[PDB]
Point group: D2
Chain length 102, copies 4
Amino acid sequence: CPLMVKVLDAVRGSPAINVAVHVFRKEPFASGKTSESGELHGLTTEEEFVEGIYKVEIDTKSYWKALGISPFHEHAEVVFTANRYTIAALLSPYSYSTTAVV
Amino acid sequence: CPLMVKVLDAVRGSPAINVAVHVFRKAADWEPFASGKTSESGELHGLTTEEEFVEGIYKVEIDTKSYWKALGISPFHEHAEVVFTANDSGPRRYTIAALLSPYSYSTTAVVTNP
Amino acid sequence: CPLMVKVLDAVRGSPAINVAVHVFRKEPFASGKTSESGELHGLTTEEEFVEGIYKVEIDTKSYWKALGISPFHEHAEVVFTANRYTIAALLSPYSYSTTAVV
Amino acid sequence: CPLMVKVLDAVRGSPAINVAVHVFRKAADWEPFASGKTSESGELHGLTTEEEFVEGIYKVEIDTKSYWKALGISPFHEHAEVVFTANDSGPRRYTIAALLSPYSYSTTAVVTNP
Ligand SMILES: Cc1n[nH]c(C)c1-c1cccc2cccnc12
Ligand SMILES: Cc1n[nH]c(C)c1-c1cccc2cccnc12
Ligand SMILES: [Ca+2]
Ligand SMILES: [Ca+2]
Ligand SMILES: [Ca+2]
Ligand SMILES: [Ca+2]
Ligand SMILES: [Ca+2]
Ligand SMILES: [Ca+2]
């Protein structure tokens, strides 16, 4: 619904599957794992998702480790003010980029 | 210098000048560690020293919100926040590079064995 | 079908709508404009899209100009060997990133 | 130096060392212009001179394919290819920064008025 996360792997050129994503609000707010498409839907509802400051934390360290690759970061963490959001994240072992589509 | 940060601005085509950078450390058991502002080349040298930079989990937070607001631009992110374990197999030098846009950032690390 | 392009704007946090995308093969091969979602489907067919070397050129200069913003690049150009492809591009006035999902 | 290129490797956490960079120029009417390889810091200074770097449309191509293949990694892109108009309102200095991964790259420009 109102909040979606999508994660891609820049080394293998694939979606990042079964990655843990935790969302906090300024406080745990929503969480899940990415699908076979790298996407995570169903995180929250329009009633629950009010304006405020949110942190999306993607567990990139566990992802790389599962592949046998040593990663730099503990996570990709993404902190923004909410005022239809997709958080996109593009992962490499020593880098990440992230954007918001609103 | 064991921890350097370099920040560029994708909207202006320039270094990101005078952007605040805060570093925190999480101990084996989330403490302020060091902070500074980027120079006219967008670089921040002198945050810390070999003697102070111990093993741990470090968070580097770049104050993107203040930077964009001071330029008259609408920032999405509160800050850009790079979290990594440092020095776990021995002392290393770390450069944290960040490229900023109002609704996106990218960051990478360069790690060298002194 | 086999080739899709998606374009996002990192300054406004929106899809990049009505952007011209030209695809070449090593020679014009396919082209179109992005939709309201920043997406361009229907570029080619599975019969047409053989293994080879392709260039996706996104007309980022015309996009920024339409918004009243002076851009650095003439285009975002993306050259790869084909051997289900999404080319994703994330645009700012002086920067772009691009990835492939295969 | 009016045209500098800096390249980092997102897989290894290092500069991208000894990567070939070719520059071409399109005239008012797609000519080789200059070329070099990145240093041990991932930087390429000395591509050109004030006197040679005229107005025009320039293409900087970074040979990502050779670089990844030499490291035993599967590259998607043939090369990373930055195309821009230069010097149109007067001489400027340009830094082209690129961050490489096997299936992705990002690039930005820093533009300064000497
Ligand atoms: C976040 C990001 N960085 N560089 C690029 C390219 C992207 C990107 C662009 C377009 C669609 C996407 C979907 C998921 C993940 N990332 C993306
Ligand atoms: C972190 C990052 N994302 N996309 C690119 C391009 C860079 C980059 C590459 C090379 C040198 C740099 C120096 C400072 C900041 N960023 C960079
Ligand atoms: Ca909940
Ligand atoms: Ca200063
Ligand atoms: Ca240790
Ligand atoms: Ca065709
Ligand atoms: Ca050298
Ligand atoms: Ca002119």
